[PDB]
Amino acid sequence: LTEEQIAEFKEAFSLFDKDGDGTITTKELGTVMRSLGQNPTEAELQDMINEVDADGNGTIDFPEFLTMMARKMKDTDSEEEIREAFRVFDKDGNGYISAAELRHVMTNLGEKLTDEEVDEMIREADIDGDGQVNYEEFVQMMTA
Ligand SMILES: COC(=O)[C@@H](N)CSC/C=C(\C)CC/C=C(\C)CCC=C(C)C
Ligand SMILES: [Ca+2]
Ligand SMILES: [Ca+2]
Numbered sequence: 001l002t003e004e005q006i007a008e009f010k011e012a013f014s015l016f017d018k019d020g021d022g023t024i025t026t027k028e029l030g031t032v033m034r035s036l037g038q039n040p041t042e043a044e045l046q047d048m049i050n051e052v053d054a055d056g057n058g059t060i061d062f063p064e065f066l067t068m069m070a071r072k073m074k075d076t077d078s079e080e081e082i083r084e085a086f087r088v089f090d091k092d093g094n095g096y097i098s099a100a101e102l103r104h105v106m107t108n109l110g111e112k113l114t115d116e117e118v119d120e121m122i123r124e125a126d127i128d129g130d131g132q133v134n135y136e137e138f139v140q141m142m143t144a
């Protein structure tokens with residue numbers, strides 16, 4: 001496990017933990033999912049938490065969140081989820097995620113990123129070096 005990977009997990013948890021109280025509730029999960037264009041029901045949100053709710057307190061803490069993330073990346077099924085996730089970023093549908101498209105989504109998640117921070121995220125996922133993220137590059141980013 002890398003110090004850099006821990007830092008990313010922390011930032012990812014922060015995007016869900018809207019009020020910063022260290023736990024992610026069904027309401028916070030639903031808010032994130034709707035900002036990504038999804039519409040889960042109250043029962044679907046409870047199911048999502050219950051899958052990883054090791055202490056049964058109805059909310060997600062940090063190690064439970066890591067468990068949730070690792071299961072999603074190490075899935076091998078639900079590639080339609082990955083295609084759906086790609087479409088969330090690729091809003092003009094042209095097959096490439098631009099820095100501007102990424103900035104737009106991060107803004108909808110409530111993030112404040114500098115121009116360099118957005119370019120660094122594109123750089124890290126870019127494989128062929130064209131300065132955008134195509135679908136194959138995205139698949140690799142979302143996969144273990
Ligand atoms: C390592 O730290 C960084 O990269 C920071 N500058 C900001 S990224 C913090 C947020 C996350 C890692 C989780 C959100 C990331 C998502 C949704 C992946 C989108 C990225 C693409 C399509 C290149
Ligand atoms: Ca919270
Ligand atoms: Ca819990």
Ligand SMILES: [Ca+2]
Binds near residue numbers: 091092094095098
């Ligand atoms: Ca695009």
Ligand SMILES: [Ca+2]
Binds near residue numbers: 128129131134137
């Ligand atoms: Ca590329």
